[PDB]
Amino acid sequence: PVYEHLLPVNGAWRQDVTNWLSEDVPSFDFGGYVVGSDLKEANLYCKQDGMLCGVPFAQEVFNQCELQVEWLFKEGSFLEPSKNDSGKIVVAKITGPAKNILLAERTALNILSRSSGIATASHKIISLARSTGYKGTIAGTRKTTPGLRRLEKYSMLVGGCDTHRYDLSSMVMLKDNHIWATGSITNAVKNARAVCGFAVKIEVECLSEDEATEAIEAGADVIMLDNHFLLECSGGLNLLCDDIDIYSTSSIHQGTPVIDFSLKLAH
Amino acid sequence: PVYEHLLPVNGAWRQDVTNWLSEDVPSFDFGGYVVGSDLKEANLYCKQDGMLCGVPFAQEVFNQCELQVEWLFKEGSFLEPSKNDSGKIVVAKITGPAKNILLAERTALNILSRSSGIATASHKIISLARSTGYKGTIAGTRKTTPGLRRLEKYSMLVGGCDTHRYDLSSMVMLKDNHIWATGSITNAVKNARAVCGFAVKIEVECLSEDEATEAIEAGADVIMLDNHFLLECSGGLNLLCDDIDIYSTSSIHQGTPVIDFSLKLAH
Amino acid sequence: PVYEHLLPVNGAWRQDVTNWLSEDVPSFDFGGYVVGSDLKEANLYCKQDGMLCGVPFAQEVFNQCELQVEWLFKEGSFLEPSKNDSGKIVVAKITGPAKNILLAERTALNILSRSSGIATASHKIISLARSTGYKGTIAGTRKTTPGLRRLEKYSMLVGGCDTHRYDLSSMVMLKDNHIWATGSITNAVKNARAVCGFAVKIEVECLSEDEATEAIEAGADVIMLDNHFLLECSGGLNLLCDDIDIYSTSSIHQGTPVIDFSLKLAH
Amino acid sequence: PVYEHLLPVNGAWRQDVTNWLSEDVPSFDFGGYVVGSDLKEANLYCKQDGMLCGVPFAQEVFNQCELQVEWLFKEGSFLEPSKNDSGKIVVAKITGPAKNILLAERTALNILSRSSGIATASHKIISLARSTGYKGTIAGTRKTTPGLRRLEKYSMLVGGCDTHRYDLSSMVMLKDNHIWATGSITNAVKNARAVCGFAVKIEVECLSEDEATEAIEAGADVIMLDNHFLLECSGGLNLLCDDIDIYSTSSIHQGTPVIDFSLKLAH
């Protein structure tokens, strides 16, 4: 199994890459004009310790820029430019017209830095939860960067964490507002079930053992206790664990530090 | 002068908001079905100390969701839910069909959290540079989140920092690769000037007083010393200042923490 | 609960309507020129017995054409222009510039006819399965019309049938190809689980009680016997039932007859 | 002459295919992950008697999925998996990474089934009209599936039927509403002619020999009698013929049965 196989050979994500490029060049690329098209070589460097993530995305950036890339590491690999010999690590060798390389650069690096950042912070928490004996799941949230949801969720998976529900059409998530609207948890679940059906799970945010039970018996698939079936707890970060099912946290993705990368031509 | 006036009454950014919404609802919105359309009220809360940024963007999210919003604070205001009475601060009151509110929620909050995060980290560094007596500029970089460049740069401005060049068509940025390509700084500048013209500035990354001088005399508009005209230094973060012109740093935007926001219905 | 609440106040589906309109007018609308903009009245007729479906979609067609519509029946209602007095039934009254009405016409009718057709054929089979005592689900398939998936699935729901999985990112569906690839059902399920996680169900097409059992124990959520958990059988149409969980059929949607509608101006 | 030559080497239709794919994979393709990329072989089967239509479209689906296809039959060929040896007929052999094949599958089959269905029902009626001695035209209508007009009209042609006017910018179609608006048929035609010009035909729906004559003399190109030049009659289905010019019917396309296809990997 290879993570990049999650991405469809063709689909919207590739168009996203094209749009990211247009975002950087609205009219002309003056630098490309001065630099020209002589064939060049270049190395893509990792300058900080962390997991390598975002390969297929950066690869797509390089393909549309008509370059030849050779990846020295598999996506998911844990890089440690700990060696101060340089403090850097070549993760890919690139070849192509000078201008194409420089056009690609900033976009590919912006993808890798952030993708690697989410994967890394993801790995750290699942390695932490795992090191206590906990056998459950650590999930992310829907508090993703607008327009970048595909990439961030993907980065969560490579890091070893669950993604939780992708969107609002994905797994139903019921709360008080919904329960108050239908008059009861049981009613909220019945209506939710009537439209999502058997193929999609229903989750209910409960505030008491009585809340949960009613949900359980309405047929809810997941139960979130805050403040047959699975249980979830969510609210906080890298710090509560018990032999329960789900712990969600936006700390793995939202507002996380980045893993620094750089790209320089040979000579 | 009002920052939101930077955004064109109509243009691509509004389409970005629609796409951000579609990203959250690819097929149906089951929750909207259970909750229904009864008119509701809700408050948008700020749960952490920082500057409020992203108003026009979140406002656009609310407009497309056909809601009525009342903002209690001007964008740019420094919020301090320091008072533990609640640890929160209502920055806007919203009204509209229950489902519309819940559809809007996650997107608007994801905009505000990140926009406020960049503005805040931006304000902290310019307030810091300013507090030493430095009279120059603190700028950002092109290491922005793919697809979110408009919002992040905008957030930089509201925070009190320069944005630097928007893209590759914006201000010309010459380096060794370009200089090596044309044979000299003077040649790189001549070619750069020939295509960008008088309306757009040319910047050159120099590594010596001789490098700079030649650039100065080629006619470069900005000079970056690393490692008539303006001078720039860039590489590091919140820590070197001297009565010089430009200090760039991706720390104001890239991989920065977020300012937490929440939204809950009345009853 | 109102079905149309499944559609997000704003999102891609509304853009689909605009594209459907452009599809009918690539350059000019000569008829609109001759007819002009005088305000007119018109009735939307149902000419065949069946369930009314597609309201929010046709409504969106009418909104973009700047018209005023009054629906005489709730979506989901079973219409019977059985009365030969006319053999027709007015389901909506429309008002607006003559040209706008005529532009709207063909698109709205093409939506209603097909949407009503799927809903009707859907209602007939669930009413049939229900009339035998069967207490389970009748679902649809992914054999939908390219580009029209949102509308057809929506029509399935209004008719009283399940939609089954929306797409490939929705509920995992494993088969022999996958099982052969990983070496075993157990392995196929483990890999499927590793990437979809807890929020999304996994279904396995089994050909024996031993196939199923292994899937059950791998943790599959649904099992399809062809040729804790739920069971599914799929292959045929309006004709096998037993007190089991799921029966899927493309007969409810694919290649189904249409429910005839017409629209004429008053005088 | 080859029908597929009607499609421009590049244009919107290819983008439609990409959108149809995205429609099936909004976020990840879990199945593609489990199945992997090992090169595989597969056969595309026809399981029902009818005409093969939709080749260039399904071919485009296969090209974007980076596969190698070998078509065993020319588009337009009449297939008869009448032989119960299998009741199936291989119409194409495919090769490529397992996941790519499975991604392609449902979309290509949904194209073929419907395209073949329209072509078949089209061939049946023109073969029927032809078998009586009728030397005229059998046309379709604008009651096409929203967003799928290009494919359905194309399927009409391959089947041997006319498409009639593509859209509202295509051939002018005047009616009572228009005639009432301008005060007379003669006036409606004059205005229609003034904007469409010589390159585009004008058709008028007449209800009497006097209606027609005035249209004829206004210069209308086609006349529809319902209830130099050409005459048309339209309203009903597979059942009135006389040595006249045009008979239109939505029965050839709208709400027609589908021709079943399937695709399975080798081993």
Next chain:
Amino acid sequence: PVYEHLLPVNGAWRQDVTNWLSEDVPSFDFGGYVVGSDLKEANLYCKQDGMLCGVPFAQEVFNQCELQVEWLFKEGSFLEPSKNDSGKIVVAKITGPAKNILLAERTALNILSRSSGIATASHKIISLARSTGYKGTIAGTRKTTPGLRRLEKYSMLVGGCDTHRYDLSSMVMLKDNHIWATGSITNAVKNARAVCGFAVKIEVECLSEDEATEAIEAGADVIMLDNHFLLECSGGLNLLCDDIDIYSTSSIHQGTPVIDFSLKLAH
């Protein structure tokens, strides 16, 4: 009859306007920031003698900029700021936030100038052909500005000229290449007819009375002699007329001078 009724209330053309706006503001509108949103008044001036064309287009520019416009002249009117009192003529009064006005300006003026230019040059030639007694048609060509075809053809109509065929799907245009391909004019026409059908005209470029005759008898709708039915001659500009049917010229649209317009705020 009003020309603007040719444009569909909604469709692609309105999106074109939005794209034209985005083209002018890729990131921020600094001027809008300095100018602010105070309500202002402004006049749209015509500075050269010619026909007013492009109203609905410029109106759409103004609507998306949320302004209030009052047109003092009907589209099609012949303006003569011949009076040197000012040499200008107010054709519309506008009101709205200062910034919105200034954003709109350049786009609306670029539409009007060119639209008015094509209409004017169109009127001049049809008034010229008409003044000799010629009772036929003066048409345009497909040599239109890429991406601006809708607007230019529309401008042709308002000027009093035919548009000729809109595109390649519009009226069939056969030539030697086609005739050589099928072996004969008769064959080229048969194949053309087989795919376009009765609703669309077929034109043939003939080089002899024998060429024409064969086309006539193949059933071609139009015949172009260069170098029942209609005849066409095309090649040259404002200068050959005889009581024949069609004279085409790109001089009415391609590379034509523009009609100068300006827009200034009140005080």
Next chain:
Amino acid sequence: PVYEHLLPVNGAWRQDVTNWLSEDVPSFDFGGYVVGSDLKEANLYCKQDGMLCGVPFAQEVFNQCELQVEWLFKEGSFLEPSKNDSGKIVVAKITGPAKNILLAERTALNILSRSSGIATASHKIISLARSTGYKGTIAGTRKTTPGLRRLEKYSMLVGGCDTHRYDLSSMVMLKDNHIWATGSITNAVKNARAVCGFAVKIEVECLSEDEATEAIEAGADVIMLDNHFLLECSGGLNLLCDDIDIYSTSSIHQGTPVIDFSLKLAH
């Protein structure tokens, strides 16, 4: 340095070409059907004296049409089919399926004709200004054809002229409206500077030596006198020069004649 290097290997401009093609073929290409796919040869001719411009654009048209092109002249070359031997000049040889050639034709020619027209008129004025001894710049304007800005500006550069500011986000352009809004030139400049920053120039339209001075001292980068820093004068065409900095004119691009091109197949 090669001008075409200004265009990014991939970005929006290539999508513009696809849209230009779709604009010509909304449904089918009947001519392509009759002509077929036999491999053919063809020559692209220049029929009027002027500079060759638009190569990368026409090349992109040819690439998407899957053709093989051989350019006989470098973009920027001054062609003179002055020789009446033919009055034409082959600038490129093309090979590919007959239909693909004919599909490409009109679009590529419409690009070249206009691109060459702007370049030519651009070269004529800079050669004129240059021939007087003037050592400054001749610039264009923002009065470009809606949707075609990239191509026209690009054509300006190849011709030897400046493009001036690309858009409203490009170089700030202040006027009376802005100055009146902020109360003074000094204030308008301060606000403009506060949002555009150091990377983008600020220009001010001054009407007196006192106007200019205040702008100069506010820090404006350019000053336009109409009716350290650079000076500009703009208003008129091919006719005032003095040893000053900038002369802008829309005459180089807007409403300029076209350079005629043609394309014919070999035999």
